[PDB]
Design a protein around this ligand. Structure first.
Ligand code: ATP
Ligand code: ATP
Ligand code: ATP
Ligand code: 5GP
Ligand code: 5GP
Ligand code: 5GP
Lengths: 474, 474, 474, 82
């Protein structure tokens, strides 16, 4: 990392304190930039979804994996649920998305409540596996909310065989009143749905797949209990990457867990965290970890700074740990504190190979939480922290241990009133990163790290320019 | 105190300007940390209650002393009141708490007004020294407010002999409709009450006791008048520690008072303040003081900064005075400016041996003030400063001196709507300090001071993370 | 009652629907009007305080009785409390008022909380029965709230022997900084206090006294249980008038209770209610009642109209019952619905001999409730209904009976920010009644009833003129 | 119900789980539920089962719909229109 001449502050820096200076560039178009990562995770975009119960669902897993990202399943998830989620994710199609399925005997209220599980805007009515109609938000309005969806479903919709080129589907949907194309299997059953923006993204994004050509997925494990057995079970379940997560990664228990997991020779990339120092990164890498997760404090659901005073600004910790890992040949992930695409761009320019996003993705349709409405009826969801699931651990002892346990924080994440979907957030993030690469003059992320020039700004410098629209920021 | 490389600001630092960097740790559990102090005060927790008339009552004294802290009685308190308070505090039980006692002829309104003097949630009806029923807030609702409590008291409650193991009381209260166990003396009179959380805290906390096994208590004295006689009277009254308090401790009058008190050889630890410089600390220690109180300006009720410009940020003053006192073999207390547990953690990491908390504890049930309700009916109390009681001092001369006297400031401290009690604040503070010790890797406070690494952050760094719930901050 | 020509509405009328037409008058001054009643109650003003626990205290009893009114003690009050209240009321002085007494060891907060029990604005510090100083609201401001009142009491105050002519006390207080004159007994003990307005009222108002020259007081009894024994006990306790009160007075149980009470020949006036019909009034009078209480529904704490639909506008019920009672030689009291002095004036013009006022007097200093402050810090108190105490009546049967029992309503009554006292409300009411008498041309209440001419107005008619200041209306 | 009320008098949760003789779940009863069972009388048919009514419009074949509703077990028929 190269800083401007004389920019040597006497304090640690956050994302708001730094800026990127443009350089001489030959990359003109954003599409000339390669966003693939080199840390062995297999993602084609630098976006990773945090192992939080409020974001890491199966719908989010499928949606993020199709666009090139990866989702880490939260720790302490039962192995049966892990197996079911992995099977569902790996049974999905690489291009066609899974729609919301409704029965003709469902009520209008149930249809309107299930319509918001995806970002397609419409659901397919299925009778014996075959599509027979579409249900939209407009059709549910102005009717009895306990009427059957059979009386409101429209029987005319665009249909194409599965495997059709996305441009043909786009041309077919160019003149359709509903921007949903129902793709069917050769026998006639429902294969899925494809929208116009879905076709555009299928032409823009590359899915993150394994050796067998199926969508990738990761799983997280804690350091309590028998870490080796849990890691072996998760590897057998089909996880493509293992994360050993704890609040304070620089301790003997985490080193023992890393050694125990590495001694099994599972053949999967190993991620450990979290540390904010170079010594902790070196210890984690020497223990056997391939990737080090960096960040203690900047989590949006984290109250460690206010309760203990322990923490560190994320930018300085990321640059230090990235320098240490590069000196040891490892890689670092930047976890926590991401609100804008500029945060992802600065984390990538700081030397990180991947950025992990948590509560920001909670305000989407694909997140497992329930959709709620505030005073102004603006859509929002609720994000909450993992709390004691990230900590080291009769009814008397349970109460005694819980008296000092970290509480579960809670925040409201507003959905974008115009888009709402997580793929739009991915579009914003990737557009910002590509524009950063074009401004710096880099064709890929390593060149972005090697060519970037950074400077320090005051509080008045951060207020320059125009803010982002609502829903584009956490 | 060790700072990060290059973190040498050109200004003095407050608690908001600094953070603690995690290090390699072997302490995994919070309960493995020893929070006892080494300054000779006798406290098992680093919390000290300020000598303010708005906080330092007898209920607060008992409650804090039972949990390992100590309360300093405010100066200029009449010696008879001092003796009564000391006798009441030293006559209390080490495990069982003192309940609110009601007569069966009392009105419902009086019972509902007395219910908020403790944090038990219920009061005991006493007839000739024997408990006959319990009164709760639910029973007082929906009835005539001038009806007798005999008509609303419930006659069925859990009863156990005094001296019973707290776990047995917890098991008995596991299935009780009211979480209050009435502990009685062998003859049958009322010994006190014990709750489930009370048993948990009795199993977690260690009472601060003297050589005779009775709860400790301290007293404060000013530098006006005959300081020696007042100190001797306070020592004879039963005070376990003496505090010589004034607004400007670095002056000749304070040195004379310290010498006069030390010449009596009372055998008690001597605390003097306040100073914010190393030279003042050295002068106070050489004068005869064993502990030096540090802080001029950060008091929540103090208007010195706005009236005179005299003051100093608390963190830098604390580190400097702690270094000076350690170089002279003394100890320092950090007085004023504490709003969050992180403030206590940073004060302990700065080199202080004890933290004195004032207005924050005013927003509790145990404080001597009256409970009030704001617009939203949220509970709160009123905190105010000592004013001329901390300063050096016919109707014409009284008015002449009072024309320039410092006024009494006033603020509203909101109670935690879910807890309200001071023991919950103590739980939060101790949990934060233990988590800080685990993050640093220290088994006790001296190791916390010796192993801590600190860094400087900007205003954007302090905004990282999630804020604390309501009532957890001053 | 004579109405204007053609004013024969097809509905029942409230106080807001009627107005008084002025006639030829010879009474010019308000002081020429005689406000004494002729119903045998003994009141020199037509104001009676309702038998409600929120208004009928001993302070209110003394204050109202001194000015010519009477207070009815609430039913179900224990006989010991009745005896104590009667003794306190009958031990008072006819001119000098009872002050708030403070000990020199009391705190400033206790003094400031006790200052609002009376309307004098100051309290007397008493040491061994002798006054030694005065404490006012101004002295309590700007000092430590836990300081003793000895340090704030002023030792210079106007003192006069008891029995002094009120005009001399007024002349002495003409030049006093504090408008409180401490009247002392010949031995030197505290006899009481007298203000300037107190002397004016002693020169204007005539106390309501019994045959022995002591302040009068009444008591109320329900129709449940042994009514005869309770009435005998209340008569022996010293009550000057008995009220048999129930929600529905026109029923067999009330008639039986009236007969049982009348068979004892106690020699006291008997009041029964409530009825809103002429037949009920005739039945109550024939049963043995001398005075009939009229009103079912208009009570400010009464929810009968909204729960059952049972009720009647108060003006029509009062005129009908007054006509019936006059035809039988009895008298009627108008109970409930009084918010303005015009309501009292119209009730007296409607034929009633006394007006019973409830919740309106709850917003005074003398009421037994505690003084509270709203958002704007405006003083107010809480009024509530008697509920089941006005109705006919194991833990299973108690719950079964309480499931259908009437709940306790609650309202906020704002105090007059400039006066606050109940004597000011009495002044407003008496001034309004005297002005009504002067407008009609009557020298007394019977002439007011015989000479009054009434008319009916629409909703627009009631909106004419200027509203009353804050605190002058319920 | 009075026995259930006495049992729930000292329970931390005011819900009594009533079970069938075999041990399966029959239902729940609260204190206020027992009070109401002692106060209110259930509306039952000739067989001692809870009553229920049904409504029918005036469009279509009203007779057939009414006959079907009567066969379904409705205890009272409502012919409703604006
Ligand atoms: N057995 C389980 N135990 C604990 N948490 C679970 C379990 N199964 C799922 N979860 C959690 O519940 C959340 C919802 O996950 P997921 O979306 O797979 O559930 P679902 O309700 O089956 O899905 P959908 O929203 O499509 O109906 C996730 O945070 C997941 O980790
Ligand atoms: N004689 C006194 N002179 C001045 N201040 C006093 C005196 N006695 C007590 N105080 C102060 O009054 C406050 C209340 O103290 P404390 O709680 O002991 O009083 P209390 O009213 O007897 O107690 P409780 O609240 O349990 O009824 C404290 O700030 C104390 O310093
Ligand atoms: N033993 C009792 N049982 C029930 N109610 C009572 C009893 N004693 C008093 N009350 C009620 O309590 C209220 C206050 O009575 P009290 O005589 O104290 O009046 P007060 O004027 O407020 O006097 P104080 O100077 O004591 O404040 C009244 O409504 C009265 O009926
Ligand atoms: N200390 C703490 N960290 C949390 C909690 N929940 C999530 N985190 C951290 O915060 C990250 C998410 O950051 P975010 O994107 O929400 O700001 C997670 O990946 C995890 O590292 C919690 O309850 N406590
Ligand atoms: N100058 C000044 N300091 C005060 C006053 N009241 C309390 N203090 C100081 O502030 C400390 C309490 O700090 P707090 O916890 O209220 O912020 C006390 O221990 C004392 O040192 C006051 O009126 N004036
Ligand atoms: N039904 C009913 N009447 C009440 C209640 N409390 C007071 N009252 C009636 O209302 C009268 C007071 O009228 P107010 O002056 O409050 O409008 C009382 O004298 C009594 O007759 C109550 O709870 N229920």
């Amino acid at each position: 990392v190269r800083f401007l001449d004389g920019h040597t502050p006497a304090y640690d820096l956050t994302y708001n304190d730094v800026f990127v200076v443009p350089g001489r560039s030959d990359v003109a178009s954003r599409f000339d930039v390669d966003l693939s990562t080199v840390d062995g995770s297999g993602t084609t975009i630098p976006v990773v979804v945090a192992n939080m119960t409020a974001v890491a669902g199966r719908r989010m897993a499928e949606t993020v994996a199709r666009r090139g990202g990866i989702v880490v399943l939260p720790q302490d998830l039962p192995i049966t649920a892990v197996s079911e989620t992995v099977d569902f994710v790996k049974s999905r199609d690489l291009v066609v998305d899974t729609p919301v399925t409704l029965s003709p005997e469902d009520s209008v209220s149930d249809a309107n409540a299930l319509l918001h599980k995806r970002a397609h805007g419409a659901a397919v009515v299925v009778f014996e596996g075959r599509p027979i109609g579409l249900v939209t938000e407009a059709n549910c309005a102005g009717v009895d909310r306990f009427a059957r969806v059979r009386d409101i479903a429209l029987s005319d919709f665009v249909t194409a065989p599965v495997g059709t080129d996305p441009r043909e589907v786009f041309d077919l949907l160019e003149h359709a009143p509903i921007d949903v194309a129902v793709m069917t299997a050769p026998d006639g059953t429902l294969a899925g749905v494809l929208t116009r923006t879905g076709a555009i993204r299928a032409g823009i994004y590359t899915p993150a797949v394994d050796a067998k050509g199926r969508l990738r997925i990761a799983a997280a494990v804690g350091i309590n209990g028998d870490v080796g057995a849990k890691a072996q079970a998760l590897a057998e379940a089909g996880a493509d990457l293992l994360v050993i997560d704890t609040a304070h990664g620089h301790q003997a228990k985490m080193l023992d867990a890393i050694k125990a997991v590495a001694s099994l020779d599972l053949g999967l990339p190993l991620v450990a965290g979290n540390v904010v120092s170079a010594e902790g990164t070196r210890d984690l890498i020497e223990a056997g970890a391939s990737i080090v997760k960096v960040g203690v404090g900047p989590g949006a659901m984290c109250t460690t700074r206010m309760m203990t005073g322990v923490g560190r600004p994320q930018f300085s910790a990321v640059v230090e740990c990235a320098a240490a890992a590069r000196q040891l040949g490892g890689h670092v992930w930047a976890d926590g504190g991401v609100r804008h695409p500029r945060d992802v761009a600065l984390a990538l320019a700081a030397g990180a190979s991947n950025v992990m996003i948590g509560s920001w993705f909670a305000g989407t349709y694909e997140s497992p939480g329930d959709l709620l409405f505030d005073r102004d009826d603006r859509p929002y969801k609720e994000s909450y922290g993992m709390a004691s699931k990230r900590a080291v651990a009769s009814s008397f002892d349970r109460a005694r241990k819980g008296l000092f346990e970290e509480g579960i924080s809670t925040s409201r994440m507003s959905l974008d009133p115009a888009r709402g979907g997580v793929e739009d957030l991915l579009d914003h993030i990737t557009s910002g990163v590509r524009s950063t690469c074009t401004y710096v003059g880099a064709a890929n992320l390593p060149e972005l790290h090697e060519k970037v020039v950074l400077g320090v700004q005051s509080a008045a410098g951060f207020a320059e320019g125009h803010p982002l629209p609502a829903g584009w920021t956490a």
